[PDB]
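HOLO CASE FILE
Compound: cardiolipin
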Amino acid sequence: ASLNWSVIVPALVIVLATVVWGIGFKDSFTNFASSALSAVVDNLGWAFILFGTVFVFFIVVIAASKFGTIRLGRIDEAPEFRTVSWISMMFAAGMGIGLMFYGTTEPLTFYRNGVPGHDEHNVGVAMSTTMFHWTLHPWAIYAIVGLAIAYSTFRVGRKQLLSSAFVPLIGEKGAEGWLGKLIDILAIIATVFGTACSLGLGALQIGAGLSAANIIEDPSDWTIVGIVSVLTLAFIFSAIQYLSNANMVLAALLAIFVFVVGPTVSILNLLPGSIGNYLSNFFQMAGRTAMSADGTAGEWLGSWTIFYWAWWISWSPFVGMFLARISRGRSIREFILGVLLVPAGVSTVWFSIFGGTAIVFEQNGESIWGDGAAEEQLFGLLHALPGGQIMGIIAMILLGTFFITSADSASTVMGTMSQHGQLEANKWVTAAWGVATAAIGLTLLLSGGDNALSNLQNVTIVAATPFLFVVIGLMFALVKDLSNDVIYLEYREQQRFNARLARERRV
Amino acid sequence: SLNWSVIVPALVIVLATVVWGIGFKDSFTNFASSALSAVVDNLGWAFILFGTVFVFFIVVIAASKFGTIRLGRIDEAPEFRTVSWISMMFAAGMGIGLMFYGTTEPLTFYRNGVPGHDEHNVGVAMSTTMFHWTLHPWAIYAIVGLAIAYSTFRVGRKQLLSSAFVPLIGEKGAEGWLGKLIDILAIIATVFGTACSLGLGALQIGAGLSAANIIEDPSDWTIVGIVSVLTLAFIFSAISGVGKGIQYLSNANMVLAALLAIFVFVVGPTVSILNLLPGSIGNYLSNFFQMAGRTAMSADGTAGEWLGSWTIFYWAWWISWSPFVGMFLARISRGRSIREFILGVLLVPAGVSTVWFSIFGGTAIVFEQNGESIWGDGAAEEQLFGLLHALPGGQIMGIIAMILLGTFFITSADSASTVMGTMSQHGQLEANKWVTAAWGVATAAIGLTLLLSGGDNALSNLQNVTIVAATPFLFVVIGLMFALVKDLSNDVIYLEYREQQRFNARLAR
Amino acid sequence: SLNWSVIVPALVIVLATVVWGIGFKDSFTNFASSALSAVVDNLGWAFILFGTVFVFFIVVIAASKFGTIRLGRIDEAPEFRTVSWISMMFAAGMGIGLMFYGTTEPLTFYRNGVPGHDEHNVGVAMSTTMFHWTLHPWAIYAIVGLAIAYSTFRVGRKQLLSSAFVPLIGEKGAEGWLGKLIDILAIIATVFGTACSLGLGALQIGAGLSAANIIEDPSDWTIVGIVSVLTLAFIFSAISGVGKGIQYLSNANMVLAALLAIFVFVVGPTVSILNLLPGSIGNYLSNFFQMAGRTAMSADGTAGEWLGSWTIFYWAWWISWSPFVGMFLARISRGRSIREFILGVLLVPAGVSTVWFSIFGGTAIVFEQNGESIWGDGAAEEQLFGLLHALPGGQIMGIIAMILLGTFFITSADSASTVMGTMSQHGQLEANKWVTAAWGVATAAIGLTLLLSGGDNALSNLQNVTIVAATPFLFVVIGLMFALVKDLSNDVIYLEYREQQRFNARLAR
Ligand SMILES: CCCCCCCCCCCCCCCCCC(=O)OC[C@H](COP(=O)([O-])OCC(O)COP(=O)([O-])OC[C@@H](COC(=O)CCCCCCCCCCCCCCCCC)OC(=O)CCCCCCCCCCCCCCCCC)OC(=O)CCCCCCCCCCCCCCCCC
Ligand SMILES: CCCCCCCCCCCCCCCCCC(=O)O[C@@H](COC(=O)CCCCCCCCCCCCCCC)COP(=O)(O)OC[C@H](O)CO
Ligand SMILES: CCCCCCCCCCCCO[C@@H]1O[C@H](CO)[C@@H](O[C@H]2O[C@H](CO)[C@@H](O)[C@H](O)[C@H]2O)[C@H](O)[C@H]1O
Ligand SMILES: CCCCCCCCCCCCO[C@@H]1O[C@H](CO)[C@@H](O)[C@H](O)[C@H]1O
Ligand SMILES: CCCCCCCCCCCCO[C@@H]1O[C@H](CO)[C@@H](O)[C@H](O)[C@H]1O
Ligand code: NA
Ligand code: NA
Ligand code: NA
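Model generated. Tokens follow.
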């Protein structure tokens, strides 16, 4: 049995090529990234937008059908994790700097400028579209992949790999053929690029925060390299439930502080308004394409919606693998519902607090927009409240933990996929994957410079385009696998044997 | 016998309110206004959010596996015929809200508009009226009635609100201070809700008698006489015990309501009404979750006063009526599945309300459009008769409207006094006559005080007081949601199969 | 064993219509216009309300416990392959409506707008097209087909529309005057709904021939020739009934439709079509109840003309096609679950329609936006050919569209004639050849008289006559809902248990 180097060599060489290209040819690299972004958006925004909603419909249908009763493993099998631990490690493994970066910038921006098909200065629209971007589509994508891997690995006992879940469509040989290796390579590439995007955004935010805190006058690239090296040493020392709990506690502390000291009643007013507007406008936002607003929503979608849909598909491999790991013995209905609704509620509360505070300030006359730097909005908001100077440090500690709870899980899963789904993989390969993620993030940030944000968005969309089709195909693979279950095999066989009525009619 | 520990606090608060209202009608009004402002500003979000959470919760309970549990033993058959059951359900749960706001509400929303929408929009008017009168209120009633029914029949506990919280607080908690507090809150909510209904009924009857020329001056003594008659009835009803007064008056209510609705339908713009019907339902389900999200931050944060006048007042009113309506619903729903109940309570009254508002609001809106407006001086109690006198043969339908105004009240305020006696006698099905009479007189008193104070308005005071009185019971209803979930999850049929999971969880480690 | 009592009433109505249309082309037009106005004004609410009630009803029936029943002997299996089954359902369910309104409808709504919305809105245009062509119509078909299938296979009753009403009127009623009336209404609706399609198809073929410049100028003789050809086919195709011509022609229909769709998709704005697709479904599902609640008094009360032209006409058209399409759907759905037939009928045709309207309406709208408008004179019968001639290699596609029109009509006309034969022969599967030929000739004659009358437009006359003829059958479908619920509830599997619950209720003391 040959070792799985056919999935290691291509990914390494591709990422090294990307690194050298981004270093030595910054202008050419940026031009190529922009051109690829334009092509991908123009030709596959429809695919992203359509299947974003098809995922949510598919997941609800699966949990409301006969398949919901199944359990992940042998019949009447019991779980191994407590419910509270299960959710605490669900939310903290599939989240990063997304909430901290776009907690304030997103609803405030949509309030100020508006969205296609709607006029500016509409709090309901701002909050509804934020909830759209952060509540049910993103976690439906994770639920589909996690459910597929959990079904493939526990009920059927296959190896813990993405290619395994495709066995019904392609067969065991196909799982071990070129197609399975291609799927694994695509998964690894998507993981690396998604995590690089997250690392870059988080580093930018930490740099802006340190600049605001007056520790540093101007954020230097050397500071970013130092931060990444510190993270490298930290995780290397590490190589988790404790860190997940710490993340939840720190996030709760910061949210509670802002809620108590900010406009409490306005936040609590925005809660029901946010949820109601979200479900009023759910399919009007899901049906938004480049042909809306007389064909003027292309740029907005490429900047906001398609970026998010590609971003959350980049993280689907390693988040889905983790969720499959931590969901042994749970029913399908319980997996799907925990995953889709607990993180959705957390995100709702987070965005309500921070977006509501920002919008209330913008209404009162005080402004935290400033120059419009998306990386300094959080710290501007905090410095607009008493005790912000001490909560900045808690925000920085949280930021750090949000990527260390995920990068830990990205590297572990990437090691797993490179060893035929072994529970533990080579430490050296894990270190190499961590270094690769760091290197990709750093080169993207440096190459982008002024346009670092846009460069990250373009690259993640390009890298995540291939895995959209993998996730689409995995829907059919999961359906076929669930249909062909031991419970219903005999019944469907009886119907198939009763298929002689067609022959009788032809007679 | 009688508790004597829930009665005394309740009577003390009622008498304090009465003396405050009569002795100092300016201080009372000022306090009511201040408390209303504070309550709205600090708990409108609670009212608005949980109004919708109730509907979601009850729909999920009906749709889930728990909707098969019968509200009796497993081999149980309903004791009431479906038509009689639903007739009593509607007659107990709807007082004078369809008569008072049948014409006023859609007409007001057409003329003035609604936050976040342009005026003179018939679809919006009808949709928001249906929002206020269809699903959200009967969802509250279904939750409370289901909790009490499950507590009393399937588990056999005492017929009280406290007994439904045994899952959360246990028997020692249901007999301690918390049980007494819940019973006192339930009694107070019932008294204040019924008093608000009594005040609105008295106002409407006075206006009607003015219109019909039976009495020239609607002075205070006329209102006292109206309340005295309205109390003598509804006290003889649950006292003489000469027969099935409750069922006979329920049937009379339904018959008179049908008669008046049919009259207006035939003599009014029939085709316009029938056009409104599908339009009303479509625009409702179109804007159902956009109205559920309307709050004090909507319309660029200027919708507070409108919500205080319309939505929060309604949500408090229906919450305050929840205790005794829920107890009655539990009473007449033995041996009915947890889904037949949750779908005969949600859907039948919602359809009746839809038809009622379609007919009356459509007639009013069509008259407004055609120039024969009936707004007059804007008195909410002078709309219906103003409408009725605008149709041929309507001069003799004022009397039927009054008879109907009365019957609606008598029927529900006889369901309320019976249940209050039951609560005050540790869950005795057949309450004491004297306790029933005392609660009826207390309700009448409170209604009279609320009406007399602030005579210039006489309507804002009712809304302020009912919101303030019903604020505490919102949390009781939410706790009822959790208690009901726990009690359904801990059924014997589910216990016998789920115990193995807990037993084997430790072994599997 | 011909009926001779259902045939004669239908024959005299058809002959009266033909004579009136031909010999008096002014009186017929005036009467049609007057009847259309009256019917719309007094029953638009009925059409609009029950359109959505049908969708809700069929969804509930598929979701409820009745979904598990099989439409055959217990533990029976389907007799037709799923792909062939669905191909036949789509090919018989619809004829020349996607070829006629594929381009005209979305383009018209994009240009002029719809009531309550501003013009030049792509989302609105697509959403309302989808509304007219996706869920409501196939819901009507599902209801009627399910009723007939359950009456015939599950209960072994006769294959008639009167038989499905046995639960409500009893066997003596099924052979009584009411059964005869229902059968006559079914035949009349079938004839007058198929004549509408024949007229539209002939008009479009004439326009296409004019566009191709095969004929110097169209004349009534060309229309008569086209109608005669389309009658010879569909009368020469039902004669044999042994060579399996219907399945082969259905497959040919699907193949040619796919070919034309693929050509337009590849050569037209592919990316814009693909952009519209998810946008279409989203906007449908957003404004699904906003459109369901659109009636004659929406948008300042000027939606009457638009509704009568578009939505009520569509509703009436599909209701008129319901008898024969439902009987055919029942015919080819033996031994399938109720849920599997209701999903197969509702969803696959809805998806095919969505894709069709995307590909064609999207191309038209994109051309409108670019300035290459295909509107021309505005005639609805040549928008498609203008569109095709606006694309490279669109000259052969003219001929392909013509053949597709022909096959479209033939596949449904054959089934209509066969079902009329079964109706006229007491539900015999194999009808007499002469009855089939006579009914085909009657359909052709009605189409011709409708087309000749009102020669200036010839389309408004078709719409008026279709609405008038399909009005009576709306109530037959509404009654079919109740009949179906009664027949499903009283099933053998449930009859053995609900008796216990009924007996226990009576002794509830
Ligand atoms: C004025 C207001 C009017 C409108 C009100 C509408 C709002 C809700 C009203 C209340 C409805 C409660 C329904 C709950 C289920 C009850 C039945 C049950 O136990 O079986 C369910 C079933 C359990 O399986 P089962 O045991 O096989 O069920 C059958 C039983 O065996 C038992 O079988 P049985 O033989 O005893 O038969 C019982 C019978 C009882 O059924 C009924 O009577 C329920 C009727 C519900 C439909 C609407 C109300 C109709 C009222 C009929 C009576 C009219 C009276 C007058 C009132 C109206 C006046 C105008 O049938 C059912 O069991 C009902 C099945 C429900 C199927 C789905 C219904 C939705 C249809 C949607 C059609 C439209 C499609 C396009 C949508 C486009 C969207 C953009 O579970 C499900 O399939 C789901 C149930 C829940 C469905 C509704 C959920 C809400 C709708 C979506 C809301 C939007 C948000 C969605 C996402 C969430 C986040 C936002
Ligand atoms: C989280 C809040 C912020 C929003 C975040 C995004 C999510 C938005 C949606 C939030 C609403 C969730 C509604 C509840 C979900 C279901 C929860 C659940 O577990 O409930 C039961 C799910 O039950 C259901 O059937 C769900 C029904 C949901 C109905 C929709 C909500 C009500 C809508 C009311 C308004 C209607 C009118 C509006 C029309 C426009 C579980 O039953 P079970 O399947 O475990 O039982 C076993 C049995 O075998 C089942 O047959
Ligand atoms: C824009 C306007 C919108 C208007 C919308 C109006 C919607 C109306 C939808 C009505 C749907 C009713 O569909 C419903 O189907 C279920 C299927 O089990 C039937 O269900 C019924 O079956 C039998 C009694 O007959 C019982 O065993 C069962 O408890 C009962 O619920 C109901 O008799 C029928 O009423
Ligand atoms: C404007 C017209 C009305 C539009 C309404 C849009 C509504 C969109 C959002 C749906 C959210 C569904 O959430 C799921 O519900 C399932 C039950 O259905 C649960 O099983 C599941 O757990 C839970 O996540
Ligand atoms: C505008 C604001 C709208 C807010 C909408 C929020 C909607 C919340 C809906 C909660 C529904 C709870 O349902 C129960 O859940 C239990 C736990 O899963 C089940 O055990 C039980 O069976 C079931 O009845
Ligand atoms: Na994390
Ligand atoms: Na009453
Ligand atoms: Na056809």
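CASE NOTES: Chain B touches chain A at residues 41-42, 44-46, 48-49, 52, 287, 289-298, 300-301, 500-501, 504-505, 508-509 (CB under 8 Å). Chain B has 21 helices and no strands.
CLOSED: yes
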